[PDB]
A paper describes a structure:
With the exception of the mobile “β-tentacle,” CP has been considered to be a rigid heterodimeric protein that is stabilized by many intra- and inter-subunit interactions. Superposition of the two structures was poor, with a root-mean-square displacement (RMSD) over the Cα atoms of 2.55 Å [residues 9–275 (α) and 3–244 (β); the “β-tentacle” was not included]. This unexpected finding indicates that CP has conformational flexibility. Therefore, we conclude that CP conformational changes are not induced solely by the binding of a ligand molecule but show that CP is an intrinsically flexible molecule. A domain motion analysis revealed that CP comprises two structurally stable domains, and the conformational change can be attributed to a twisting movement between the domains. The larger domain contains roughly two-thirds of the CP residues [residues 1–258 (α): 1–42, 175–192, and 235–277 (β)] and consists of the entire “N-stalk,” “α-globule,” and “β-tentacle” motifs together with parts of the “central β-sheet” and “antiparallel H5s,” whereas the smaller domain [residues 259–286 (α): 43–174 and 193–234 (β)] consists of the remaining portion. A structural comparison analysis revealed that CP consists of two rigid domains, CP-L and CP-S, and undergoes conformational changes even in the absence of a ligand. In addition, we chose CPβΔC for crystallization, since the “β-tentacle” does not participate in the CARMIL interaction. All of the crystals were grown under conditions similar to those for the ligand-free CPβΔC, and the structures were solved at 1.7–1.9 Å resolutions (R = 0.184–0.213, Rfree = 0.238–0.263).
The actin capping protein (CP) specifically binds to the barbed end of actin filaments with a high affinity and prevents the addition and loss of the monomers at this dynamic end. V-1 and CARMIL proteins directly bind to CP and inhibit the filament capping activity of CP.
Numbering used by the authors:
A (entry chain B): 2 to 244
B (entry chain A): 8 to 276
The structure:
């Protein structure tokens, strides 16, 4: 079904990015057997839920989904409650808590608002996780904006143990919409995906969270610049080539 | 999900192909649906709607310039009107092929207004758009004489993985001594040399103008179009700047207020 999967992924590169969730839903109705393949290969816009026990927002994606429930990174439980939802080891949960606090500060520094969430899961020979950041503009301004960062990190922890291999796959979706007298409605939307891999020392001076933090920071800064160039450079150049 | 639902979804996707990327989307949708006969039946209308929505320009053997495929030129049963050359032609929506040009007429009450407006418009278009094309129709619609001017301009660069198109549609309803003006201007750009980015924009325009003779009024029509299209284009560029320097920054800073990258040892302590 590789030919069909190739067509599905290509089609998603072409349908208007303003309609992602809808298009992916339609695409699975169109090819039901490709469901797991598509849920696993196509990134979806992040959604917010409220953790009422701690009074914090958290982010929903397929990475913290089990059946029809989602796990909060603050309270480490599913909503709605589940019988046996997937949860991290005690070991990995401590790292997850530390990473959530680290990325709240990182979000506060680069984004000055919005919501973050980190979800980690155990692997046979290490672990993996996602770092999610959502920032929306002030929607009382004629110019509305949403940024979603989805950074997947896969860590192979090598016995021993003072070394690890990090693979980082990062997607940023960025949407801007303005409604002005002069320009009518303008909707600029899309996403960019980048990947990197690196071996790093793991120590007290360089713990997993610092290694992952620097990879994410380096990658997100690079993606921001690429988006700046494509969104406000390249598409503007094309428009002006039309008239 | 039924076959009827699947082909509804297929038809929708085809209608949403970016400019310059119809073949790609159609072949994707064809292989996913994997039922050619169902595609032909449930989705035929979509191939036609795409071309008419897009104002696809078409070359006709024996005639200079190109004509736009629009709803306003639809003659039914696969044929379209070229109101400047006064012919009809069969259009293949899948291959984007014009065939079988035959002499034709439709409206003649507005023949001279249509002809005045087309001449004025064609010069305007060829002056302001690199490879623009226009088609002007004259019709009686729900009681009223109407001049409808369609403009198209596109740049397809599939080897650089980008495509763009501009469309504008200007309706002048003639109730002497005034004509009411309604227009919609549209732009679409898709860049995918990296990952999928699209600009979709439209602007609605309402105006009125004083009608005199066909020649003077055509001139008046063109001045309104030229100003609104300049206005819209300037405003689009102004808005990019505001977005680039204000709104974007408000989503993510380049660097923290510290003006340097993160001290991770501080974060972790
Ligand atoms: Ba995945």
């Amino acid at each position: 079904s590789d030919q069909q999967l190739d067509c599905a992924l290509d089609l998603m590169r072409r349908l208007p990015p303003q309609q992602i969730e809808k298009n992916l839903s339609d695409l699975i109705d169109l090819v039901p057997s490709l469901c797991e393949d598509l849920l696993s290969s196509v990134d979806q816009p992040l959604k917010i839920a409220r953790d009422k026990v701690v009074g914090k927002d958290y982010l929903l994606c397929d990475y913290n989904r089990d059946g029809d429930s989602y796990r909060s990174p603050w309270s480490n439980k599913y909503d709605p409650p589940l019988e046996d939802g997937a949860m991290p080891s005690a070991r990995l949960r401590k790292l997850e808590v530390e990473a959530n606090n680290a990325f709240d500060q990182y979000r506060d520094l680069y984004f000055e608002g919005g919501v973050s969430s980190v979800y980690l899961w155990d692997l046979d020979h290490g672990f993996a996780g996602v770092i999610l950041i959502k920032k929306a503009g002030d929607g009382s301004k004629k110019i509305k904006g949403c940024w979603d960062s989805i950074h997947v990190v896969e860590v192979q922890e090598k016995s021993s143990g003072r070394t690890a291999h990090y693979k980082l796959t990062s997607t940023v979706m960025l949407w801007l919409q303005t409604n002005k007298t002069g320009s009518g409605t303008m909707n600029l939307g899309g996403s960019l995906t980048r990947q990197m891999e690196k071996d790093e020392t793991v120590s007290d001076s360089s713990p997993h969270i610092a290694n992952i933090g620097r990879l994410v920071e380096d990658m997100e800064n690079k993606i921001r610049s690429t988006l700046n160039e494509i969104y406000f450079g390249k598409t503007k150049d094309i428009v002006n080539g039309l008239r | 999900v039924s076959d009827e639902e699947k082909v509804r979804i297929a038809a929708k996707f085809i209608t949403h192909a970016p400019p310059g990327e119809f073949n790609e989307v159609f072949n994707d949708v064809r292989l996913l649906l994997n039922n050619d006969n169902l595609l032909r039946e449930g989705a035929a209308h979509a191939f036609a709607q795409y071309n008419m929505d897009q104002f696809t320009p078409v070359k006709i053997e024996g005639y200079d310039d190109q004509v736009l495929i629009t709803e306003h030129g639809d003659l039914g049963n696969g044929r379209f009107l070229d109101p400047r050359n006064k012919i009809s032609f069969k259009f293949d929506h899948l291959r984007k092929e014009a065939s079988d040009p035959q002499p034709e007429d439709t409206e003649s009450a507005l023949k001279q207004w249509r002809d005045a407006c087309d001449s004025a418009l064609r010069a305007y278009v060829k002056d302001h758009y690199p490879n623009g094309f226009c088609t002007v129709y004259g019709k009686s619609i729900d009681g009223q004489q109407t001049i409808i001017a369609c403009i198209e301009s596109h740049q397809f660069q599939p080897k650089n993985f980008w495509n763009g198109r501009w469309r504008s549609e200007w309706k002048f309803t003639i109730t002497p001594p005034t004509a009411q003006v309604a227009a919609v201007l549209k732009i679409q750009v898709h860049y995918y040399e990296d990952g999928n980015v699209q600009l979709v924009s439209h602007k609605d325009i309402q105006d009125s103008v004083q009608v005199s003779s066909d020649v003077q009024t055509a001139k008046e029509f063109i001045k309104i179009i030229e100003n609104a299209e300049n206005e819209y284009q300037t405003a689009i560029s102004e808005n990019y700047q505001t977005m680039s320097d204000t709104t974007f920054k408000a989503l993510r800073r380049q660097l923290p207020v510290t003006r340097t990258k993160i001290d991770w040892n501080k974060i972790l302590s």
